[PDB]
Amino acid sequence: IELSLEQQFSIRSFATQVQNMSHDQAKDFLVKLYEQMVVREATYQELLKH
Amino acid sequence: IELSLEQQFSIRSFATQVQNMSHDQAKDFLVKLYEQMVVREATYQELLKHQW
């Protein structure tokens, strides 16, 4: 639950780049990021269960 | 990557919701989602450590 300074820097920096995105770019990025998350969660769950 | 059928359904569900967002809604939700991904990652790292 406690984030590192580097994690916090990454989020704050991402947020500044999101503000330059068009409507179309933000939408395509959302769907791609959700897909990355769902795949990554499945990977972690497998590692944990093994 | 090759997605499972359940992943395909979840992502399509999410795509329907997104394609109906305004510019500002999509930007705001993107920053929230990225934060949630980082937090989840931190949580998983904690769970792995508490096995080994």
Q: Would you say domain B1-52 falls under CATH 3.30.70.1520?
A: no
Paired tokens of A8: 């916090």
Q: List the single best residue of A25, A35, A41, A47 to mutate versus B (max B Cβ within 10 A).
A: A35
Q: Which residues contact B29 (CB under 8 A, 6 or more apart)?
A: A30, B18, B21
Nearest to B44 by CA among A11, A36, A1: A1
Residue B51's identity, in one-letter code, is Q
Domain covering A1-50: architecture: Orthogonal Bundle (1.10)
Q: Is A8 helix (H, G, I), strand (E, B) or coil?
A: helix
Experimental structure resolution, Å: 1.8
Considering CB atoms only, which of A26, A31, A48 is closest to B11?
Answer: A31
> What's the rounded Cα separation, in Å, for the pair B36 and B16?
20
Query: Where in chain A are the domains?
Result: 1-50
- What are phi and psi for residue B3, nearest 5 degrees? -90, 145
